Amino acid sequence: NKILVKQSPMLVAYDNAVNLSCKYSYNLFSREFRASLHKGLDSAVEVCVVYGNYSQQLQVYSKTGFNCDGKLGNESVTFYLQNLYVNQTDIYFCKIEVMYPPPYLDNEKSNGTIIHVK
Amino acid sequence: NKILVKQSPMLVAYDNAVNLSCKYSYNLFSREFRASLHKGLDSAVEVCVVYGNYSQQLQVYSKTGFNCDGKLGNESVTFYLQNLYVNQTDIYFCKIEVMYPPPYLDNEKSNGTIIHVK
Amino acid sequence: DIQMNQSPSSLSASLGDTITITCHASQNIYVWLNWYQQKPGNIPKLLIYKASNLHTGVPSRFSGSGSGTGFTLTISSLQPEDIATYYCQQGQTYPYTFGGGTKLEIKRADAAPTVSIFPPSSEQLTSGGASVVCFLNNFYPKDINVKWKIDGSERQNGVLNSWTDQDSKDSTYSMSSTLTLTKDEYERHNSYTCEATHKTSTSPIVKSFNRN
Amino acid sequence: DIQMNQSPSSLSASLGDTITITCHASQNIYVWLNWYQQKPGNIPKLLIYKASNLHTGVPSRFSGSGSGTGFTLTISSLQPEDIATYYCQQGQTYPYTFGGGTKLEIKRADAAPTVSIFPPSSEQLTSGGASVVCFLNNFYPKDINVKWKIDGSERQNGVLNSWTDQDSKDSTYSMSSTLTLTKDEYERHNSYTCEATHKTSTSPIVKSFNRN
């Protein structure tokens, strides 16, 4: 199948921070999931990855040097990006995947969200 | 059919101006065409419309208040946007249509171009 | 949508006069507003497009200016031929919207109305009816009062009037008045009078006919 | 890709010594670099992940620190059991890349090599060959020279040696030397000598046998 993703069309950073909320087409709750934020039209850089597994506290992280924070919420995940640089102004795309229970589930490429860091 | 559109992934405005070049999948030259630049993920605003008709000098214009300039070039059009505001930083999409000689021809929605006006 | 507010809802000026109309827009339409002319019962024609751009064939006596929210149409050296109604429309944002229009009257020398009364035609009476008609033509200004006098008494029941638009050729006005009675009640009176009072005269212009 | 530059390519330290290794990265890997341990001929095991995060089961004598471009592994209170080679790998960007590794030797008390010579086995000679073997076991340091003396003369043709890795149990080194001749040329000489000189002695340790 294909999960749905609804995200804000734009987000103006306040104090070089913003809140990236991703609205999904999925679950009341409890499965093993890997949420992802990617920056760029060529979606190169993966800004953040909030991992979940039923219970076990949400494990957010970044391999790219972003001060990322993640908050769960049923059919949504919110990426709290801090210390964003003005040169990081770009289109960010949300991604969601379930790895258990099977089968593998993925999202249909969203319309994205332009983050304008002033 | 469907015309192709290749545009830069990003453009940082210099002095509040930029050059939007759109690479098409079409003609050596001479047909009646209407090129279009639209701003927004919901492509609301149509920033500029450069009209061509074989010869008759290129007729560029804006109904939205943009200081637009257009330059033709075989399989490409370049939108020279001046006096851009910092709050105009967004994704701009190129559009191309032929109205003669028939049949009507249109472009496949491009990947767009994020214009970062600092 | 956007609102079009034309100023003079109407206006009278003399031959050669350089009048002016105004059209304010609720919000910014930039230079996307056109002006149109539509003579009485005629089709509307483009006069000015893109604020100041004249349309091919429109005399230079027609001018136009404005940007953003304020707009104005100027016609210098008025001609009778300019008798018409003028609308402002914006071509910036869907839905397109026009103004209320402005009526114009080319003012000319006062004129007396040539009155004409006409009895019920024979063919009509044969049908049980009777329509006495009164013509009041080519007069200026357009102010005129018609009273019907069946013998000596005034009558207002069964009277229908009609006015034509200002003559684009000699700038006058015309009016017709029809008093429709039945064959029965028409045959019991003798004298039928059509009376008109116009600025052109302190004394009423009277026209009447008897059953002979 | 990213380059991993481990510092000590090798290192010897004594029991209880608190050594340290270094791994510099060409560019910024942040805190995504892990350390691994791989004993002689063994499988590599995770020691430290995410710069300072120890892996479940790794003693606290193992520590790790660094960020961005500089990284370091520290093992305090050395144990013989730590004899191994240590690699640094980055887990930030594809392709993943490890370092060159660093070898470690736990330094112990000097030891003399127990030498042992062995004539060609009967079953071998039956095949036309003859291999005289010499064992030089459990000695420290790993510096040792073996000369073969067929009678009084020195021989170097047909001699193959082999060294084992430092004994993780008693930290010593061992070596075997095999002199392979033919049955023919082996039978024309009488005395076969295996001689070794080690720091442990100024006088060579000699072991020899005659065709009786």
Next chain:
Amino acid sequence: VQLQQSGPELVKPGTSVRISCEASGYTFTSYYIHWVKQRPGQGLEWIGCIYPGNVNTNYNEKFKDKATLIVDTSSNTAYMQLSRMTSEDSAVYFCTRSHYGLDWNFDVWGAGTTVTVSSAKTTPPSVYPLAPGSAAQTNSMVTLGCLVKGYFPEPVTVTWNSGSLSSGVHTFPAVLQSDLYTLSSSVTVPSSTWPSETVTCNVAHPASSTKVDKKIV
């Protein structure tokens, strides 16, 4: 570059009529076709537009349901469907176009199609000749006339001597009396021309296919 429009139509309150507008003299697929309605005495308002080519359409929210824009790329025809009509639908509907690339204004208009949404009866007119008595309301010249009473619906046409008489003619606007229409027309001529030369007025009412001719005696 002409823009031909359909003839007037009478519609009974509730039904749906679809007027037309065929282009001729330019490239049909290089222009938008806009529809605008003008109520009697009122200004004109933009209904919607359609672009022959990619058949894309745009409507004004004030006519979302009624108005349905259709196009016919073969006969260069643009149709306009007005469904569910009421006395608020009665007005003259115009046809016009806008350049597709340079969409700035409407320079070519159709002559319009008057639409009445009345359930009254179609009735031919009763034409009555108007001739003078024993007076003269303008010496040296006479004024004759024609009374067209009780017709429906509008319009009727009034010529004088098969169109040969056009000077000094005043056809007054029709007034609606008790659901029917009554109009009159006046014609001024030299008293030296009448009664010697005969005068006739021609009355046409397409709505009921009636053509009358009345001579003034």
Next chain:
Amino acid sequence: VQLQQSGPELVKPGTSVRISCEASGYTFTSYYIHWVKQRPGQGLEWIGCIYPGNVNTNYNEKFKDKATLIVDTSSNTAYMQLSRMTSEDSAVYFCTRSHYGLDWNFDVWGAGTTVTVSSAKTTPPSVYPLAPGSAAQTNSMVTLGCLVKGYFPEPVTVTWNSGSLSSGVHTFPAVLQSDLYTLSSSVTVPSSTWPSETVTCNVAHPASSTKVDKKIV
């Protein structure tokens, strides 16, 4: 959570072999399977990885053509295809995994699969017993040994008394002489135990399915 790997294989220069690695003890589709090669004496380098689940794969540009990553979600097996091999392909290939969500490192490694790409001949070894003469290189205790000469390919195994003898054993690394392999193993035992109690060394060479037993007399 074990990671079983295929046995050693001999490959003739030019051909392609496909080793395996089957997971067991965890959720196969919740981890990446990474392949890394370690050349004899050299460090180890990352070949590529594969994620059972969406079957996505990632390769290091240094092995783009040879390496082809395949997955088997039924037997929890991860295969690695090395096509067109050369003496630069000879190395021990390891198997390991990375957590899919928290992809930080490789915590479970296979024991490896040694791969030789030599066109030499498979030959069983010739085992020769090493017994002492009339001396004593370490009084009160003897050192016996076993010579394993001329075998191919690696490896061979050397136990002493069916595995009952593990203390005082030194099996020296194999040296390659003229395309073949020769190794020796030493075993130290109390002179009070030998020659009374018999000593035997066991030599196994899977490559040619040969198992030998030589007693020292």
